[PDB]
């Protein structure tokens, strides 16, 4: 099961940012990979795995903390598109593919 | 596969989940391999694994191995597309030479006719119609060397009298280049198709590996000649680039307008079928 | 009949005493209806009347109706005593091979030879004498075909290098635009002299509809470039005014200077006799 | 369209819209172009417009001009109707005799064939027994002049033996309009197919334009001997009249019950398509 995982807080007070940086470190612990800011995601073996994996989130949550969880296959993981204002790849239909020099 | 991946990067490749994973430092991205048609690897620190090429076995899919020069230098070719090879290889070895230089001679045909064809598009006259004459005057065994004659008019009208295809430019280097993936791709269809790439259906003294493939790919040089001949001001590496783009690029096929990959897949399958069924049809492609 | 009656202006059309009455704005012209032999209406603002179209059914004259573009869409026929025409038309299903491809290497050779009388007016003297060799090397069947080769150098001579046919530019369409009103003209002579205008002259390519018409006004094409050629810089707007008013402009035929009109109509006539008496002579035209 | 317009009164028809404009001093009325198939003007006094007449050429509508007798003069026949005209002309003219000569037997032997259906509905035994056995023995090349004798009992068996073919009577004048008007609707759906209309399937001696689609219209002829032969009593004004009512009627077609510009159009279609694939089937019209 591919768990997609975003996460939002105010980051506005000291406090506020030295618990993300937390939460954040205990998400890279667990196994999680950051895609992008606040755009995670962890490969889960099982169901149960998932679900000890939600209580231990729920568990280090922080204060004003905000996690979304969804669960993806492997097809829409591998759709998944990022665009940053240039898009994926993985989206396109392009025949030819360039990692190297465009030209 | 409908995708063409070239890798000119150092970076690791893995087999996860029926997956291409390309792992680098600054960045990870995953390609399925259904869509993945060709894998090429244009430069020698790219890191790849055993499984995955016997993945890319499996799935059928052309790995080419490239030099430092990034020229092509080894591609991978499986023993066993599928089962239907080793019973073809009787078949091959019971064909005749009649058949062989029937086909092989509306295959030259096809040839010179998309040379006349091309400097028609290219419209010039004794370059073109006299290709055109030469075609016409076409016989087996090929006594007068038409086709020889056909190419040296070609390319001696198209980038100058003095030109020459024993020269070492980057006109001929760029048409060696052309040839050598082309010649890769035919060479890949005929190793689906199972049958012998030694064996050629012209001569049956000169021995090569890629003689069979040559033939089947003789009707399509003329397009990378256009290319060639468009961007033979540019540098060698733009002219790479517009090599490359004739993988998206679509051409006109005499039942409706497919990509080249499948052209010359559906090509070489009606020339086996043609070559087993002693001359049914001959598949003509104009451009 | 004889006079041949054309109608390029809005009007109106009676029958009455054995007589033909056209009346427009400016005067009004009754004709006898035994003087006139062929009846052609230009523009789709005409106006007639069916007691004058069965007088015309009567007196055997063919009509011809033609659309906003002026080229023929429709003509009328009878039920009984049909014109000579449609008796000529078999002989143009009779036309040789060999009759065909000589009137078609002589328009090919005019056309060419006009193109580089024109790059000679021009002052370039290496493009014109290229194009005249390829006009004296020009052979039957094509087994030339420097139509092309005349082409290319013209082209690239006229607008430069980088211009070229298959490119979208106002020069192209402008192009078009010329070839489309030589087209409507050449083709409403031969509408006139009846013959079948999707029989063509050139055998490889039955795809246009307009095939004996544009293999006929190929010629006088170059007259068209040099006015694209002056007027280039101008927008397409007013390269369509510079070209409307080549109907005005008076031409040298080889006899005496005439309209293009008249140029035309014996150019076509000369063409067609030749066409049925296989190869009597054949009509010749110089810029 | 499915509409048929006819105008016997004197007026003036204008384009507008899209829609055909009838004016006239005491009302007029607007119809789509769309809905309307034939366009039939049956007096002298009728006034067009030439831009009308262009719209009803891309329209593809049948226009016919008939005289002050009433009887059709001349119809418009566009020399354009679709662009496989032109890729048409090459197979017409590439036909084999066996194919048009059994084409043209199987199309007697259906109208012969209709002949002993009409005089079997008509419940005589012996005439339809004869001209079944003159279909019975029906012969390609026609030595024994199966269907010209089938035509003379069948008149001469309807209308009596001192009745005849060439007679002046009102019944050969509605025999003979039946024929021009049924002959102009079978010709504009050859215009439609773009296959020359003066080639005939039978004689290649006989030079006519309405041959082949005389030999086309030849099993619809009893259709309208019914009709004749019914109404020759009445005066030849209600039997024009009752041979208007055919249009409106609908007649069964093998597949299922059409209008007869359907069943034409859909015969047509059928005969030039087995004529080009050298009768793959051939269509069967009964009453």
Known sequence: MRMI?????????????????????????????????????????????????????????????????????????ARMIYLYGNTSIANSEERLVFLGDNY | GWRTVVVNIHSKLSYKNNHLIFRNSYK????????????????????????????????????????????????????????????QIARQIAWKENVKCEVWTAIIAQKILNQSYYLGECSFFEKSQSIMELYHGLERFDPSNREGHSARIYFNTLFGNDFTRESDNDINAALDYGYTLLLSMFAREVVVCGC???????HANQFNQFNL??????????????????????????????????FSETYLYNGKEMYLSNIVSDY????????????????????
């Open chain 1, 5 to 77: 995982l975003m996460f939002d807080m105010p980051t506005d007070t000291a406090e506020e940012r030295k618990a993300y940086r937390k939460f954040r470190k205990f998400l890279l612990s667990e196994g999680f990979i950051m895609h992008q800011f606040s755009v995670y995601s962890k490969l889960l073996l099982n169901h149960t795995a998932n679900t000890a994996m939600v209580g231990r989130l729920k568990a280090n949550n922080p204060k004003k903390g905000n996690i979304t969880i969804l669960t993806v296959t492997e097809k829409q993981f």
């Open chain 2, 213 to 246: 493939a040559s033939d089947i790919m003789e009707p399509f040089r003329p397009i990378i000649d256009r290319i060639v001949y468009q961007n033979r001001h540019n540098n060698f590496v733009k002219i790479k680039k517009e090599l490359f783009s004739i």
């Open chain 2, 268 to 287: 070489t399958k009606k020339v086996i079928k043609a070559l087993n069924q002693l001359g049914e049809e001959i598949p003509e492609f104009r451009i």
């Open chain 2, 28 to 87: 990870t991205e995953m390609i399925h391999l259904s869509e993945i048609d060709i894998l090429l690897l244009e430069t020698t620190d790219i890191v790849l694994t055993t499984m995955l090429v016997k993945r890319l076995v499996d799935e059928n899919i052309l790995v080419i191995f490239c030099d430092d020069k990034r020229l092509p230098t080894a591609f991978l070719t499986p023993y066993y597309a599928r089962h239907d090879s080793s019973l």
């Open chain 2, 196 to 202: 012998m790439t030694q064996i050629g259906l012209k």
